Design a protein around this ligand. Sequence first.
Ligand SMILES: N[C@@H](Cc1c[nH]c2ccccc12)C(=O)O
Ligand SMILES: N[C@@H](Cc1c[nH]c2ccccc12)C(=O)O
Ligand SMILES: N[C@@H](Cc1c[nH]c2ccccc12)C(=O)O
Ligand SMILES: N[C@@H](Cc1c[nH]c2ccccc12)C(=O)O
Ligand SMILES: N[C@@H](Cc1c[nH]c2ccccc12)C(=O)O
Ligand SMILES: N[C@@H](Cc1c[nH]c2ccccc12)C(=O)O
Ligand SMILES: N[C@@H](Cc1c[nH]c2ccccc12)C(=O)O
Ligand SMILES: N[C@@H](Cc1c[nH]c2ccccc12)C(=O)O
Ligand SMILES: N[C@@H](Cc1c[nH]c2ccccc12)C(=O)O
Ligand SMILES: N[C@@H](Cc1c[nH]c2ccccc12)C(=O)O
Ligand SMILES: N[C@@H](Cc1c[nH]c2ccccc12)C(=O)O
Ligand SMILES: N[C@@H](Cc1c[nH]c2ccccc12)C(=O)O
Lengths: 66, 66, 63, 66, 66, 63, 63, 66, 66, 66, 63, 66
Amino acid sequence: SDFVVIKALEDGVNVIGLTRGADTRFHHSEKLDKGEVLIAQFTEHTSAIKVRGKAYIQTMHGVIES
Amino acid sequence: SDFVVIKALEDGVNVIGLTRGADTRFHHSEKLDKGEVLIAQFTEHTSAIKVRGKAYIQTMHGVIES
Amino acid sequence: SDFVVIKALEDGVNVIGLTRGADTRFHHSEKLDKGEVLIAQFTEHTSAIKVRGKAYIQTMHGV
Amino acid sequence: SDFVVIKALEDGVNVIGLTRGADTRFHHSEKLDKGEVLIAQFTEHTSAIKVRGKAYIQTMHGVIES
Amino acid sequence: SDFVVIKALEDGVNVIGLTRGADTRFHHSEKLDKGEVLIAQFTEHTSAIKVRGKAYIQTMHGVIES
Amino acid sequence: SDFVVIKALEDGVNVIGLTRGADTRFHHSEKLDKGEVLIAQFTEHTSAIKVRGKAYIQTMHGV
Amino acid sequence: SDFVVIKALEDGVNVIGLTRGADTRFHHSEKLDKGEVLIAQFTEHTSAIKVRGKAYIQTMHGV
Amino acid sequence: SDFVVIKALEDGVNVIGLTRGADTRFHHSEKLDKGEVLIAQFTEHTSAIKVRGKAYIQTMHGVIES
Amino acid sequence: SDFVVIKALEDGVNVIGLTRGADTRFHHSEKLDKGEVLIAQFTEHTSAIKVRGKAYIQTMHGVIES
Amino acid sequence: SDFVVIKALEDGVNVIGLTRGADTRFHHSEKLDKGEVLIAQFTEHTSAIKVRGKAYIQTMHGVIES
Amino acid sequence: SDFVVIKALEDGVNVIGLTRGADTRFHHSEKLDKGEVLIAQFTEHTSAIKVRGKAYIQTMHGV
Amino acid sequence: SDFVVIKALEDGVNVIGLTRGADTRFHHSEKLDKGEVLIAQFTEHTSAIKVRGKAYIQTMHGVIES
Ligand SMILES: N[C@@H](Cc1c[nH]c2ccccc12)C(=O)O
Ligand SMILES: N[C@@H](Cc1c[nH]c2ccccc12)C(=O)O
Ligand SMILES: N[C@@H](Cc1c[nH]c2ccccc12)C(=O)O
Ligand SMILES: N[C@@H](Cc1c[nH]c2ccccc12)C(=O)O
Ligand SMILES: N[C@@H](Cc1c[nH]c2ccccc12)C(=O)O
Ligand SMILES: N[C@@H](Cc1c[nH]c2ccccc12)C(=O)O
Ligand SMILES: N[C@@H](Cc1c[nH]c2ccccc12)C(=O)O
Ligand SMILES: N[C@@H](Cc1c[nH]c2ccccc12)C(=O)O
Ligand SMILES: N[C@@H](Cc1c[nH]c2ccccc12)C(=O)O
Ligand SMILES: N[C@@H](Cc1c[nH]c2ccccc12)C(=O)O
Ligand SMILES: N[C@@H](Cc1c[nH]c2ccccc12)C(=O)O
Ligand SMILES: N[C@@H](Cc1c[nH]c2ccccc12)C(=O)O
């Protein structure tokens, strides 16, 4: 099962889960302060993930650092 | 399931999901402002993804940037 | 399932999906303007994809 | 599921699908003008593919350029 | 399913499918003129493929040319 | 199933498990003191893990 | 299923299929003339293949 | 199933199993004195493992030592 | 399904199939003259193969040449 | 199915199996004298293995020599 | 299923199979004389193998 | 299924199959004279193979010769 690693590079980063299904809305926003890490899966309820703010992101595809 | 990473390189990038099935229409357009990232799977409802605007994109096949 | 990445290098690139089944016709053509990207899977309804117009294209086999 | 990429290197290339089953006949011919690309799967209805005209062809086995 | 790529290097190459099952006979012969290509799977009906004429052939095992 | 290796590099590192399902809340926070290690899986109940505090972290994607 | 690639380097190469089962006999011999190619699978009916005559042969193990 | 190797580098190292399920508590603490090794799987009952004390640890992800 | 390639390096090579089951006896011996090749599978009826005479043998493990 | 190789580097090494299930206790201790080797699987009854004494240990993760 | 290759480098090497299950005892010890080889699988009845005596041993993890 | 290649390097090599199950006895001994080869699988009836005599042996793990 696929997952995303997000490390915040500043205060106030948001990681937002978008709902799986015919409809798409934000179901949760997790706040990260500078240096906090979130390792989040794709799930039965989450089929897309949006990241706002300067962040280091790893997935199976590789890395993107803000 | 396969997924795409999109990093917006300018304001107002749109990531659009196209419906799976006999019919094809846009079901959702997620706006991304500069530096924001979307990690989005293909799903039961989305079998094609369209990106408009300056974006850095990674898939299983590699990177596509501009 | 397998997918193709198409980036339009001109305006009006057509990504044309062809029907899975005994019959072969286009059921959808998605237009891409210069610099726009489509990542499109093979699916229950699409078993062949045609690209008309100048495009950078990636598949599992390469670019 | 296996697939073939065909890029036409001249006008009037034909990509022809041959029927799956005990009988073999052409069920469809798709025309490609110079520079047009066809990415076609093997399917429930297509077990062989014939290409006529100068074409660049990729499969899992590698490349043949006319 | 496994497949074979055949590129005809002269006019009048024949790609022949041999029947799967207790009995073995030719069920189809596809003629290829010079530069024409056939990508052909093994199937429920075809368990051996015969090539006659000058051909460049790729399989999973490699290339065989002349 | 997939797992994460967290080594605390300060006292009071919190490894926070978030609920699998429609709702997202923390159901458990495991505290790690400096030098202590937690190897934690994704499971039926945990679909996201947050680490608060300075930590060396390994996943399938790298450190 | 596994297959063998035989290219005849003389006239009258015989590719001989032997019966899968308790009994072992040839059920088919396919003749190849010089330069002709047979790509032949193992199947429900063929569990051993014999090549008589000079031939270039590829399998999963090499040439 | 995935497993962890722990080698104690001092007396009194504890390897603790945390319960799988909605609830999370310690169910067992195995003490390791210097040079002693535990190879421990994740299981139906254990979905997280905690190490306290100076240890050399190997997992699928690599080594972690001190 | 596993298989053995045998090429005879002299006249009179024998490739012998030993029966699968509680009992073990030779069920067939195939003769190979110099330069003849046998590609033989392990099967429902054959769980061991004996080769007598100077032969070049390939399996998944590699090569043995007499 | 995963397994551990233990070679004793002194007399009196013990390899101890810990029970699978909600409860954890030692179910068996196998003694190894210097140079004796134990190759032990994880099983329906054993989910953790403890080694006491100077030992060379290999698992899928690599080697630890006392 | 997984297997071990034992080559005896002295006379009287014992390859000892231990019972799969709740109980652990030896159910079989196969003696090897110098230079003799045993290739032995893990099975429904054997979940641990002990080698007593000087031996060259290969597993999936190496020698 | 896994298999072993044995090449006899002297007359009178024996390849012995040991029974699978709760009981262990020899069920078959195949004699190999010099240069003769046996390729033998593990099976429903054979879960250990013993070689006596000078032999070159290949398995999935590598080669063992003398
Ligand atoms: N509700 C959408 C979410 C989604 C996933 N991938 C997307 C790509 C573009 C737009 C929306 C999405 C779905 O499950 O299909
Ligand atoms: N509704 C279409 C969407 C699609 C996927 N790939 C395509 C390629 C071309 C055109 C449309 C598509 C389908 O599910 O099949
Ligand atoms: N309707 C055809 C479409 C197709 C796929 N691959 C092809 C190759 C050639 C011609 C047509 C096709 C089918 O599903 O089989
Ligand atoms: N109708 C044939 C088509 C075919 C596939 N591979 C071939 C090779 C040779 C000749 C015909 C074929 C079949 O399904 O079997
Ligand atoms: N009881 C929790 C244990 C757990 C696993 N990974 C975690 C990460 C953080 C907190 C707790 C956990 C569960 O099975 O899901
Ligand atoms: N309850 C959410 C937790 C979650 C997983 N990945 C996420 C990414 C973003 C936001 C929330 C999450 C879920 O199971 O889907
Ligand atoms: N009718 C034969 C065709 C065949 C496949 N491989 C062969 C090798 C030799 C001779 C015939 C064959 C079968 O299906 O088994
Ligand atoms: N009828 C035999 C054919 C065979 C396959 N491999 C062999 C090796 C040796 C001798 C005969 C064979 C069988 O199906 O088992
Ligand atoms: N009848 C035996 C044949 C066999 C396979 N591997 C062996 C190794 C040694 C001796 C005999 C065998 C069986 O099916 O098990
Ligand atoms: N009875 C425990 C044994 C165990 C496995 N891994 C562990 C890690 C730590 C403590 C105990 C264990 C179980 O089956 O889950
Ligand atoms: N009858 C034993 C044979 C065996 C396999 N591996 C062993 C190792 C040691 C002793 C005996 C064995 C069993 O099937 O389990
Ligand atoms: N009867 C034990 C044998 C065993 C396997 N691995 C072990 C490790 C240590 C001690 C005993 C064992 C079991 O099946 O589980």
